[PDB]
Amino acid sequence: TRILLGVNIDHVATLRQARGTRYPDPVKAALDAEEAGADGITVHLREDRRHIQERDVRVLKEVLQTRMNFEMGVTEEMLAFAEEIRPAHSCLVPERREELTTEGGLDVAGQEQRIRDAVRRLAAVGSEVSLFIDPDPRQIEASARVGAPAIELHTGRYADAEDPEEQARELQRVREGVALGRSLGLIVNAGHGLHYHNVEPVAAIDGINELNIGHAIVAHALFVGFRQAVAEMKALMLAAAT
Amino acid sequence: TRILLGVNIDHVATLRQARGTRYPDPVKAALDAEEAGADGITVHLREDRRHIQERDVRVLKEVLQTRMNFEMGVTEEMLAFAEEIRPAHSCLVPERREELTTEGGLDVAGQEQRIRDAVRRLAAVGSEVSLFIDPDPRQIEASARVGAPAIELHTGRYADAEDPEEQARELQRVREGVALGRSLGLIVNAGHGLHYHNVEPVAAIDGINELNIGHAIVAHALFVGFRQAVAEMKALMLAAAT
Numbered sequence: 001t002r003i004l005l006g007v008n009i010d011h012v013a014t015l016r017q018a019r020g021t022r023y024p025d026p027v028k029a030a031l032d033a034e035e036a037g038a039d040g041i042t043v044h045l046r047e048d049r050r051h052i053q054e055r056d057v058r059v060l061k062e063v064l065q066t067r068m069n070f071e072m073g074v075t076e077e078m079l080a081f082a083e084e085i086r087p088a089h090s091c092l093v094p095e096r097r098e099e100l101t102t103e104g105g106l107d108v109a110g111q112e113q114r115i116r117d118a119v120r121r122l123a124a125v126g127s128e129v130s131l132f133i134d135p136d137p138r139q140i141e142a143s144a145r146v147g148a149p150a151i152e153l154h155t156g157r158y159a160d161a162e163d164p165e166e167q168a169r170e171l172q173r174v175r176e177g178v179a180l181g182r183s184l185g186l187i188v189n190a191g192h193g194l195h196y197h198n199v200e201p202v203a204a205i206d207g208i209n210e211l212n213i214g215h216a217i218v219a220h221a222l223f224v225g226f227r228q229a230v231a232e233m234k235a236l237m238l239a240a241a242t
Numbered sequence: 243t244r245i246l247l248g249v250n251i252d253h254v255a256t257l258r259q260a261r262g263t264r265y266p267d268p269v270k271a272a273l274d275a276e277e278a279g280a281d282g283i284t285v286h287l288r289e290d291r292r293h294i295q296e297r298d299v300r301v302l303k304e305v306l307q308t309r310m311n312f313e314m315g316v317t318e319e320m321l322a323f324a325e326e327i328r329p330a331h332s333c334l335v336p337e338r339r340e341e342l343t344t345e346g347g348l349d350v351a352g353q354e355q356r357i358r359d360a361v362r363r364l365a366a367v368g369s370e371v372s373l374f375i376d377p378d379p380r381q382i383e384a385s386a387r388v389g390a391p392a393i394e395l396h397t398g399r400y401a402d403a404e405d406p407e408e409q410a411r412e413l414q415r416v417r418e419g420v421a422l423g424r425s426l427g428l429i430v431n432a433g434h435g436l437h438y439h440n441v442e443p444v445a446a447i448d449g450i451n452e453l454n455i456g457h458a459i460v461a462h463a464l465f466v467g468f469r470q471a472v473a474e475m476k477a478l479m480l481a482a483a484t
Contacts, residue, residue, distance in 0.1 A: 014260050015461060018253055023437065024461040032465065195265065219257060219266040222460065223274060225467040 003203055003241040005234045006069050006191070007033040008042035008214025013051035015218075026052065027059050029218075029226050034065045036230035040089065042212045044071035045078065047095055054081070061085055069212065070127070074099065074111075074118045083125050090122050091130040091152060091212075104192075105134035105154040109142040116146040123147075130189060135177030143186065150187035152212060153177045155202060159193030167198075175205050182207045196220060196233065200240040211237060245445055245483040247476045248311050248433070249275040250284035250456025255293035257460075268294065269301050271460075271468050276307045278472040282331060284454045286313035289320070289337055296323075303327055311454065313374075316341070316360045325367050332364050333372040333394060333454075347376035347396040351384040358388040365389075372431060377419035385428065392429035394454065395419045397444060401435030409440075417447055424449045438462060438475065445482040453479060 012026040030041045041064055045052050060068060070087035072078040073095035082090055092115065094100040094107070101107050108115050108131055115131065122129045130150035133139040143151045153174050161167035174190060181188040187209045190202055195216035203211060213233060221229040254268040272283045283306055287294045302310055309330035314320045315337030324332060334357065336342045336349065343349045350357050350373055361371045372392035375381040385393045395416055403409035416432065423430040429451045432444055437458035445453060455475060463471035 011257060011260055012464060015253060015257055015457075015464065018256050019435075019457045021437075021457070021461075023458070024464050029464060195263075215261045215263075216265070218464065219263075221465075221467075222254060222257070222266050222271060222463050223468050225463075225470070226465055228467070 003208055003237050004039040004210035005037070005230070005237055006040040006042045006189075006210050006212040007038040007217055007230055008044065008071075008191075008212055009033070009218070010042075010044050010051050011215050011218040013053070013056060017051055026056050027063060029221075030060055031063060031065075032226040033230045036227040037234045038066065038230050039210065040067045040069050042069040042071060042091075042214065044093065045081070047073055047075065047077070057081075057085055061087075069130075071132075074114060079118060079121050082122055082127065086125050087127050089130065090127040091132055092118060092148075093132040101134055101136075101139075103134040103136075103154060104156055105136070105139060106132050108133060108139055108146060108148075112142060112146055115148075119146055119148050123149075128187075130187070132192075135173040137176075137180055140177060140180050140186070141184065143181075144184040148186070150189060150209070151181050152189035152191065153181075154192055155190045156193045158202070159195070159198055171201055174202060178205050178207045196236065199233070199236055203237040203240040208241070245450055245479050246281040246452035247279070247472075247479055248282040248284045248431075248452050248454040249280040249459055249472055250286070250311075250313075250433075250454055251275070251460070252284075252286050252293050253457050253460040255295070255298060259293055268298050269305060271463075272302060273305060273307075274468040275459075275472045278469040279476050280308065280472055281452065282309045282311050284311040284313060284333070284456065286335065287320070287323075289315055289317065299323075299327060303329075311372075312369075316356060321360060321363055324364060324369070328367050329369055331372065332369045333374055334360060334390075335374045343376055343378075343381070345376040345378070345396060346398055347378070347381060348374050350375055350381050350388060354384055354388055357390075361388055361390045365391075370429075372429070374434075377415040379418075379422060382419060382422050382428070383426065385423075386426040390428075392431060392451070393423050394431040394433065395423075396434055397432045398435045400444070401437070401440060413443055416444065420447050420449045438478065441475070441478055442482040445479040450483070 009026040012029040067088035069089035071091045131143045131148045158170040178188045191212035251268040254271045311331040312329035313333045373385045377395045400412035420430045433454035
Protein backbone atom coordinates (compact mmCIF):
# COMPACT_ATOMS: atom_id res chain seq x y z
CA THR A 1 0.00 0.00 0.00
CA ARG A 2 0.91 3.69 0.24
CA ILE A 3 3.72 5.32 2.20
CA LEU A 4 3.02 5.74 5.92
CA LEU A 5 3.54 8.68 8.28
CA GLY A 6 4.55 8.25 11.90
CA VAL A 7 4.42 11.48 13.90
CA ASN A 8 6.94 11.87 16.71
CA ILE A 9 5.67 14.12 19.50
CA ASP A 10 8.84 14.36 21.64
CA HIS A 11 9.45 18.05 21.06
CA VAL A 12 5.95 18.96 22.17
CA ALA A 13 7.24 17.78 25.54
CA THR A 14 10.45 19.77 24.96
CA LEU A 15 8.28 22.89 25.07
CA ARG A 16 6.42 21.64 28.16
CA GLN A 17 9.57 20.85 30.15
CA ALA A 18 10.88 24.38 29.51
CA ARG A 19 8.55 25.83 32.16
CA GLY A 20 7.65 22.65 34.03
CA THR A 21 3.94 23.06 33.34
CA ARG A 22 1.31 20.56 32.27
CA TYR A 23 0.98 22.19 28.84
CA PRO A 24 1.53 21.69 26.03
CA ASP A 25 0.42 18.08 26.41
CA PRO A 26 2.17 15.71 23.97
CA VAL A 27 -0.86 13.44 24.45
CA LYS A 28 -3.18 16.08 22.96
CA ALA A 29 -0.77 16.61 20.06
CA ALA A 30 -0.73 12.84 19.46
CA LEU A 31 -4.54 12.74 19.36
CA ASP A 32 -4.62 15.73 17.03
CA ALA A 33 -2.11 14.02 14.73
CA GLU A 34 -4.16 10.82 14.43
CA GLU A 35 -7.27 12.88 13.77
CA ALA A 36 -5.30 14.70 11.06
CA GLY A 37 -4.31 11.46 9.36
CA ALA A 38 -1.19 10.15 11.10
CA ASP A 39 -0.74 6.40 10.64
CA GLY A 40 1.05 6.04 13.96
CA ILE A 41 2.46 8.00 16.88
CA THR A 42 6.15 7.79 17.79
CA VAL A 43 7.42 8.48 21.30
CA HIS A 44 10.98 8.35 22.63
CA LEU A 45 11.42 7.96 26.39
CA ARG A 46 15.04 8.89 27.08
CA GLU A 47 16.97 7.75 30.14
CA ASP A 48 17.71 11.38 31.05
CA ARG A 49 13.96 12.08 30.68
CA ARG A 50 14.84 15.17 28.63
CA HIS A 51 11.32 15.66 27.25
CA ILE A 52 8.92 12.70 27.34
CA GLN A 53 8.08 11.28 30.76
CA GLU A 54 6.72 7.87 31.83
CA ARG A 55 3.38 9.60 32.33
CA ASP A 56 3.33 10.47 28.63
CA VAL A 57 3.81 6.88 27.43
CA ARG A 58 1.32 5.42 29.91
CA VAL A 59 -1.43 7.89 28.96
CA LEU A 60 -0.70 7.41 25.24
CA LYS A 61 -1.23 3.67 25.72
CA GLU A 62 -4.74 4.40 27.00
CA VAL A 63 -5.79 6.93 24.34
CA LEU A 64 -4.09 6.10 21.01
CA GLN A 65 -6.49 5.30 18.16
CA THR A 66 -3.74 3.97 15.87
CA ARG A 67 -0.55 2.42 17.23
CA MET A 68 2.46 3.35 19.35
CA ASN A 69 6.04 3.36 18.10
CA PHE A 70 8.07 3.32 21.31
CA GLU A 71 11.61 4.57 20.76
CA MET A 72 14.07 3.53 23.43
CA GLY A 73 17.73 3.00 24.26
CA VAL A 74 18.68 -0.59 24.98
CA THR A 75 18.66 -0.82 28.78
CA GLU A 76 16.98 -3.12 31.29
CA GLU A 77 14.80 -0.27 32.56
CA MET A 78 13.39 0.51 29.11
CA LEU A 79 12.92 -3.14 28.14
CA ALA A 80 10.97 -3.88 31.32
CA PHE A 81 8.90 -0.75 30.77
CA ALA A 82 8.17 -1.77 27.17
CA GLU A 83 7.19 -5.28 28.31
CA GLU A 84 4.59 -3.51 30.44
CA ILE A 85 3.49 -0.98 27.81
CA ARG A 86 3.30 -3.63 25.06
CA PRO A 87 3.69 -1.17 22.18
CA ALA A 88 2.70 -2.32 18.68
CA HIS A 89 5.94 -0.91 17.33
CA SER A 90 9.27 -0.16 19.00
CA CYS A 91 12.56 1.29 17.80
CA LEU A 92 15.99 0.80 19.36
CA VAL A 93 18.10 3.97 19.26
CA PRO A 94 21.52 4.99 20.63
CA GLU A 95 21.67 7.29 23.66
CA ARG A 96 25.07 6.43 25.14
CA ARG A 97 28.56 6.84 23.66
CA GLU A 98 29.22 3.09 23.40
CA GLU A 99 26.20 2.29 21.21
CA LEU A 100 26.69 5.34 18.97
CA THR A 101 28.37 5.32 15.57
CA THR A 102 30.07 8.47 14.27
CA GLU A 103 27.10 9.22 12.01
CA GLY A 104 24.60 8.67 14.82
CA GLY A 105 22.93 5.33 14.12
CA LEU A 106 22.82 2.34 16.47
CA ASP A 107 25.97 0.21 16.31
CA VAL A 108 24.15 -3.10 15.87
CA ALA A 109 27.25 -4.73 14.40
CA GLY A 110 29.21 -3.84 17.53
CA GLN A 111 26.60 -5.22 19.94
CA GLU A 112 24.84 -8.03 18.07
CA GLN A 113 24.05 -10.27 21.05
CA ARG A 114 22.85 -7.35 23.18
CA ILE A 115 20.53 -6.15 20.42
CA ARG A 116 19.33 -9.70 19.65
CA ASP A 117 18.17 -10.19 23.25
CA ALA A 118 16.39 -6.83 23.15
CA VAL A 119 14.67 -7.71 19.88
CA ARG A 120 13.63 -11.08 21.27
CA ARG A 121 12.16 -9.61 24.47
CA LEU A 122 10.23 -6.95 22.57
CA ALA A 123 8.97 -9.41 19.94
CA ALA A 124 7.79 -11.78 22.70
CA VAL A 125 5.61 -8.90 23.85
CA GLY A 126 4.14 -8.60 20.35
CA SER A 127 6.08 -5.55 19.25
CA GLU A 128 7.40 -5.16 15.71
CA VAL A 129 10.96 -3.99 16.34
CA SER A 130 12.88 -1.49 14.25
CA LEU A 131 16.59 -0.66 14.50
CA PHE A 132 17.72 2.93 13.97
CA ILE A 133 20.88 2.61 11.89
CA ASP A 134 23.03 4.51 9.40
CA PRO A 135 22.55 3.66 5.72
CA ASP A 136 25.61 1.42 6.03
CA PRO A 137 25.53 -2.01 4.31
CA ARG A 138 27.34 -3.52 7.29
CA GLN A 139 24.78 -2.28 9.83
CA ILE A 140 21.86 -3.30 7.61
CA GLU A 141 23.19 -6.85 7.30
CA ALA A 142 23.77 -7.07 11.05
CA SER A 143 20.22 -5.86 11.66
CA ALA A 144 18.92 -8.74 9.54
CA ARG A 145 20.97 -11.27 11.54
CA VAL A 146 19.74 -10.19 14.97
CA GLY A 147 16.20 -10.84 13.79
CA ALA A 148 14.75 -7.34 13.66
CA PRO A 149 11.80 -7.13 11.23
CA ALA A 150 12.55 -3.50 10.39
CA ILE A 151 15.19 -0.79 10.15
CA GLU A 152 14.91 2.99 10.13
CA LEU A 153 17.59 4.68 8.04
CA HIS A 154 19.37 7.71 9.50
CA THR A 155 18.48 10.52 7.08
CA GLY A 156 20.45 13.07 9.12
CA ARG A 157 23.42 13.45 6.77
CA TYR A 158 21.02 13.89 3.86
CA ALA A 159 19.23 16.63 5.80
CA ASP A 160 22.49 18.26 6.92
CA ALA A 161 23.98 18.38 3.42
CA GLU A 162 25.40 21.80 2.55
CA ASP A 163 25.83 21.56 -1.23
CA PRO A 164 23.40 19.89 -3.70
CA GLU A 165 26.13 17.43 -4.75
CA GLU A 166 26.62 16.23 -1.17
CA GLN A 167 22.86 15.83 -0.76
CA ALA A 168 22.68 13.78 -3.95
CA ARG A 169 25.34 11.41 -2.59
CA GLU A 170 23.61 11.05 0.77
CA LEU A 171 20.22 10.51 -0.87
CA GLN A 172 21.88 7.80 -2.95
CA ARG A 173 23.15 6.12 0.22
CA VAL A 174 19.62 6.06 1.60
CA ARG A 175 18.37 4.73 -1.73
CA GLU A 176 20.94 1.93 -1.71
CA GLY A 177 20.09 1.24 1.93
CA VAL A 178 16.41 0.67 1.17
CA ALA A 179 17.19 -1.67 -1.74
CA LEU A 180 19.57 -3.72 0.42
CA GLY A 181 17.21 -3.94 3.39
CA ARG A 182 14.24 -5.15 1.36
CA SER A 183 16.47 -7.71 -0.36
CA LEU A 184 17.10 -9.08 3.14
CA GLY A 185 13.36 -9.06 3.79
CA LEU A 186 13.49 -6.06 6.10
CA ILE A 187 10.85 -3.36 6.43
CA VAL A 188 12.66 -0.08 5.75
CA ASN A 189 11.82 3.24 7.40
CA ALA A 190 13.46 6.67 7.65
CA GLY A 191 12.70 10.19 8.88
CA HIS A 192 15.36 11.82 11.06
CA GLY A 193 16.03 15.45 10.12
CA LEU A 194 13.40 15.51 7.38
CA HIS A 195 11.36 18.67 6.88
CA TYR A 196 8.82 20.15 4.45
CA HIS A 197 11.46 21.11 1.89
CA ASN A 198 13.56 17.92 1.70
CA VAL A 199 11.07 15.14 2.47
CA GLU A 200 9.83 14.55 -1.10
CA PRO A 201 12.98 13.00 -2.61
CA VAL A 202 13.10 10.54 0.31
CA ALA A 203 9.39 9.71 0.09
CA ALA A 204 9.92 9.10 -3.63
CA ILE A 205 12.22 6.14 -2.94
CA ASP A 206 10.59 2.87 -3.97
CA GLY A 207 10.05 0.51 -1.05
CA ILE A 208 10.07 3.05 1.77
CA ASN A 209 7.46 1.88 4.28
CA GLU A 210 7.06 4.62 6.87
CA LEU A 211 8.62 8.00 7.54
CA ASN A 212 8.88 8.93 11.21
CA ILE A 213 9.05 12.71 11.40
CA GLY A 214 8.92 14.78 14.58
CA HIS A 215 10.78 18.06 15.07
CA ALA A 216 9.98 19.67 11.70
CA ILE A 217 6.29 18.86 12.13
CA VAL A 218 6.29 20.35 15.63
CA ALA A 219 8.18 23.39 14.33
CA HIS A 220 5.69 23.86 11.49
CA ALA A 221 2.77 23.34 13.87
CA LEU A 222 3.74 26.55 15.68
CA PHE A 223 2.51 28.40 12.60
CA VAL A 224 -0.40 26.38 11.17
CA GLY A 225 -1.43 24.11 14.04
CA PHE A 226 -0.68 20.43 14.63
CA ARG A 227 -3.69 19.18 12.66
CA GLN A 228 -2.78 21.16 9.54
CA ALA A 229 0.95 20.47 9.91
CA VAL A 230 0.39 16.71 10.00
CA ALA A 231 -2.05 16.80 7.08
CA GLU A 232 0.29 18.92 4.95
CA MET A 233 3.24 16.60 5.61
CA LYS A 234 1.25 13.47 4.78
CA ALA A 235 -0.04 15.02 1.55
CA LEU A 236 3.53 15.82 0.47
CA MET A 237 4.61 12.23 1.12
CA LEU A 238 1.63 10.69 -0.71
CA ALA A 239 2.06 12.95 -3.74
CA ALA A 240 5.79 12.21 -3.88
CA ALA A 241 5.42 8.44 -3.43
CA THR A 242 3.02 8.28 -6.38
CA THR B 243 -6.74 53.26 26.88
CA ARG B 244 -7.22 49.51 26.40
CA ILE B 245 -5.04 46.73 27.80
CA LEU B 246 -2.01 45.84 25.67
CA LEU B 247 -0.60 42.48 24.62
CA GLY B 248 3.13 41.93 24.31
CA VAL B 249 4.06 38.55 22.88
CA ASN B 250 7.27 36.95 24.12
CA ILE B 251 8.83 34.64 21.53
CA ASP B 252 11.62 33.05 23.61
CA HIS B 253 10.30 29.50 23.51
CA VAL B 254 10.01 29.40 19.74
CA ALA B 255 13.80 29.58 19.91
CA THR B 256 13.71 26.94 22.66
CA LEU B 257 12.17 24.57 20.14
CA ARG B 258 14.77 25.63 17.57
CA GLN B 259 17.85 25.11 19.75
CA ALA B 260 16.68 21.57 20.53
CA ARG B 261 17.81 20.39 17.09
CA GLY B 262 20.03 23.32 16.14
CA THR B 263 18.25 24.10 12.88
CA ARG B 264 17.06 27.44 11.51
CA TYR B 265 13.46 26.45 12.18
CA PRO B 266 11.29 27.34 13.88
CA ASP B 267 12.34 30.97 13.40
CA PRO B 268 11.28 33.27 16.27
CA VAL B 269 11.46 36.11 13.73
CA LYS B 270 8.67 34.54 11.66
CA ALA B 271 6.60 33.98 14.80
CA ALA B 272 7.05 37.63 15.82
CA LEU B 273 5.91 38.84 12.40
CA ASP B 274 2.95 36.47 12.60
CA ALA B 275 2.21 37.84 16.08
CA GLU B 276 2.17 41.47 14.91
CA GLU B 277 -0.02 40.53 11.95
CA ALA B 278 -2.38 38.79 14.38
CA GLY B 279 -2.73 41.89 16.55
CA ALA B 280 0.17 41.90 19.02
CA ASP B 281 0.98 45.38 20.34
CA GLY B 282 4.65 44.59 20.84
CA ILE B 283 7.21 41.79 20.68
CA THR B 284 9.21 40.75 23.74
CA VAL B 285 12.57 39.00 23.42
CA HIS B 286 14.99 37.90 26.14
CA LEU B 287 18.65 37.57 25.18
CA ARG B 288 20.25 35.59 28.01
CA GLU B 289 23.93 35.57 28.93
CA ASP B 290 23.98 31.78 28.57
CA ARG B 291 22.25 32.09 25.16
CA ARG B 292 19.81 29.36 26.19
CA HIS B 293 17.31 30.15 23.43
CA ILE B 294 17.45 33.61 21.79
CA GLN B 295 20.66 34.52 19.95
CA GLU B 296 22.25 37.79 18.79
CA ARG B 297 20.95 36.95 15.31
CA ASP B 298 17.38 36.91 16.63
CA VAL B 299 17.50 40.40 18.14
CA ARG B 300 19.29 42.06 15.22
CA VAL B 301 16.93 40.63 12.59
CA LEU B 302 13.90 41.58 14.71
CA LYS B 303 15.13 45.19 14.80
CA GLU B 304 15.00 45.20 10.98
CA VAL B 305 11.57 43.60 10.56
CA LEU B 306 9.35 44.61 13.51
CA GLN B 307 6.27 46.63 12.55
CA THR B 308 5.47 47.54 16.16
CA ARG B 309 8.12 47.77 18.88
CA MET B 310 10.65 45.56 20.64
CA ASN B 311 10.63 44.83 24.36
CA PHE B 312 14.18 43.76 25.10
CA GLU B 313 14.48 41.68 28.27
CA MET B 314 18.00 41.56 29.65
CA GLY B 315 20.18 41.02 32.70
CA VAL B 316 22.16 44.06 33.79
CA THR B 317 25.76 43.59 32.66
CA GLU B 318 28.20 45.89 30.86
CA GLU B 319 28.28 43.64 27.81
CA MET B 320 24.48 43.60 27.61
CA LEU B 321 23.92 47.31 28.28
CA ALA B 322 26.26 48.24 25.43
CA PHE B 323 24.43 45.80 23.15
CA ALA B 324 21.13 47.46 24.04
CA GLU B 325 22.68 50.89 23.44
CA GLU B 326 23.46 49.83 19.86
CA ILE B 327 20.15 48.02 19.27
CA ARG B 328 18.10 50.85 20.81
CA PRO B 329 14.84 49.01 21.54
CA ALA B 330 11.74 51.13 22.15
CA HIS B 331 11.05 49.15 25.31
CA SER B 332 13.42 47.31 27.62
CA CYS B 333 12.89 45.20 30.73
CA LEU B 334 15.51 44.45 33.37
CA VAL B 335 15.32 40.86 34.64
CA PRO B 336 17.40 38.77 37.05
CA GLU B 337 19.84 36.20 35.64
CA ARG B 338 22.43 35.88 38.41
CA ARG B 339 22.01 34.49 41.94
CA GLU B 340 22.68 37.74 43.79
CA GLU B 341 20.04 39.71 41.90
CA LEU B 342 17.33 37.07 42.39
CA THR B 343 14.83 37.37 45.22
CA THR B 344 13.24 34.26 46.71
CA GLU B 345 10.06 34.86 44.73
CA GLY B 346 12.08 35.32 41.55
CA GLY B 347 11.86 39.02 40.76
CA LEU B 348 14.75 41.46 40.37
CA ASP B 349 16.16 42.58 43.71
CA VAL B 350 16.00 46.29 42.90
CA ALA B 351 16.09 47.27 46.57
CA GLY B 352 19.39 45.45 47.07
CA GLN B 353 21.12 47.05 44.09
CA GLU B 354 19.44 50.45 43.66
CA GLN B 355 22.52 52.29 42.36
CA ARG B 356 23.43 49.56 39.87
CA ILE B 357 19.87 49.53 38.52
CA ARG B 358 19.64 53.34 38.55
CA ASP B 359 22.63 53.58 36.20
CA ALA B 360 21.17 50.89 33.93
CA VAL B 361 17.84 52.72 33.70
CA ARG B 362 19.60 56.01 32.97
CA ARG B 363 21.77 54.53 30.22
CA LEU B 364 18.84 52.83 28.48
CA ALA B 365 16.63 55.90 28.82
CA ALA B 366 19.39 57.96 27.20
CA VAL B 367 19.03 55.69 24.17
CA GLY B 368 15.30 56.44 24.06
CA SER B 369 14.11 53.20 25.63
CA GLU B 370 11.17 52.94 28.02
CA VAL B 371 12.62 50.82 30.82
CA SER B 372 10.64 48.29 32.85
CA LEU B 373 11.73 46.42 35.97
CA PHE B 374 10.66 42.81 36.52
CA ILE B 375 9.86 42.76 40.23
CA ASP B 376 7.81 40.82 42.77
CA PRO B 377 4.43 42.27 43.77
CA ASP B 378 6.19 43.55 46.90
CA PRO B 379 5.77 47.10 48.32
CA ARG B 380 9.51 47.50 48.97
CA GLN B 381 10.54 46.55 45.43
CA ILE B 382 7.81 48.71 43.90
CA GLU B 383 8.93 51.75 45.89
CA ALA B 384 12.59 51.15 45.06
CA SER B 385 11.73 50.97 41.35
CA ALA B 386 10.17 54.44 41.55
CA ARG B 387 13.30 55.76 43.26
CA VAL B 388 15.72 54.53 40.58
CA GLY B 389 13.72 56.44 37.97
CA ALA B 390 12.33 53.56 35.94
CA PRO B 391 9.12 54.55 34.13
CA ALA B 392 7.58 51.07 34.38
CA ILE B 393 7.44 47.83 36.37
CA GLU B 394 6.37 44.29 35.48
CA LEU B 395 4.85 42.28 38.33
CA HIS B 396 5.89 38.64 38.76
CA THR B 397 2.60 36.77 38.33
CA GLY B 398 4.31 33.41 38.81
CA ARG B 399 2.93 32.71 42.28
CA TYR B 400 -0.59 33.59 41.15
CA ALA B 401 -0.10 31.26 38.19
CA ASP B 402 1.47 28.52 40.35
CA ALA B 403 -1.34 28.50 42.93
CA GLU B 404 -2.69 25.02 43.72
CA ASP B 405 -5.90 25.77 45.66
CA PRO B 406 -8.48 28.47 44.79
CA GLU B 407 -7.93 30.14 48.18
CA GLU B 408 -4.20 30.58 47.54
CA GLN B 409 -4.88 32.00 44.08
CA ALA B 410 -7.29 34.58 45.49
CA ARG B 411 -4.58 35.74 47.90
CA GLU B 412 -1.89 35.95 45.23
CA LEU B 413 -4.22 37.85 42.89
CA GLN B 414 -4.81 40.33 45.71
CA ARG B 415 -1.06 40.89 45.98
CA VAL B 416 -0.98 41.73 42.28
CA ARG B 417 -4.00 44.01 42.63
CA GLU B 418 -2.35 45.89 45.48
CA GLY B 419 0.87 45.97 43.47
CA VAL B 420 -0.81 47.72 40.55
CA ALA B 421 -2.46 50.26 42.85
CA LEU B 422 0.82 51.13 44.57
CA GLY B 423 2.74 51.44 41.31
CA ARG B 424 0.21 53.79 39.72
CA SER B 425 0.14 55.87 42.90
CA LEU B 426 3.87 56.39 42.37
CA GLY B 427 3.21 57.28 38.73
CA LEU B 428 4.55 54.00 37.38
CA ILE B 429 3.32 52.04 34.38
CA VAL B 430 2.43 48.59 35.71
CA ASN B 431 2.74 45.41 33.65
CA ALA B 432 2.50 41.67 34.28
CA GLY B 433 2.26 38.43 32.34
CA HIS B 434 4.66 35.76 33.56
CA GLY B 435 3.12 32.31 33.90
CA LEU B 436 -0.26 33.52 32.67
CA HIS B 437 -2.20 31.22 30.35
CA TYR B 438 -5.58 31.02 28.63
CA HIS B 439 -7.38 29.91 31.79
CA ASN B 440 -6.02 32.34 34.41
CA VAL B 441 -5.25 35.50 32.42
CA GLU B 442 -8.71 37.09 32.69
CA PRO B 443 -8.72 37.96 36.41
CA VAL B 444 -5.34 39.64 35.86
CA ALA B 445 -6.45 41.50 32.74
CA ALA B 446 -9.51 42.67 34.69
CA ILE B 447 -7.33 44.53 37.20
CA ASP B 448 -7.87 48.29 37.04
CA GLY B 449 -4.81 50.09 35.74
CA ILE B 450 -3.00 47.13 34.19
CA ASN B 451 -1.14 48.47 31.17
CA GLU B 452 0.35 45.57 29.24
CA LEU B 453 0.58 41.81 29.70
CA ASN B 454 3.75 40.18 28.39
CA ILE B 455 2.93 36.54 27.70
CA GLY B 456 5.22 34.02 26.04
CA HIS B 457 5.26 30.31 26.89
CA ALA B 458 1.49 29.84 27.06
CA ILE B 459 1.02 31.48 23.65
CA VAL B 460 3.77 29.33 22.13
CA ALA B 461 2.24 26.21 23.72
CA HIS B 462 -1.24 27.03 22.40
CA ALA B 463 0.19 27.89 18.97
CA LEU B 464 1.20 24.24 18.59
CA PHE B 465 -2.51 23.42 18.29
CA VAL B 466 -4.16 26.38 16.53
CA GLY B 467 -1.20 28.22 15.02
CA PHE B 468 0.64 31.34 16.16
CA ARG B 469 -1.71 33.79 14.44
CA GLN B 470 -4.82 32.28 16.04
CA ALA B 471 -3.11 31.75 19.41
CA VAL B 472 -2.09 35.41 19.60
CA ALA B 473 -5.51 36.66 18.49
CA GLU B 474 -7.37 34.42 20.96
CA MET B 475 -5.25 35.62 23.89
CA LYS B 476 -5.75 39.29 23.00
CA ALA B 477 -9.53 38.91 22.73
CA LEU B 478 -9.69 37.31 26.20
CA MET B 479 -7.72 40.20 27.65
CA LEU B 480 -9.80 42.89 25.93
CA ALA B 481 -13.09 41.35 27.04
CA ALA B 482 -11.86 41.07 30.62
CA ALA B 483 -10.49 44.62 30.84
CA THR B 484 -13.78 46.20 29.73
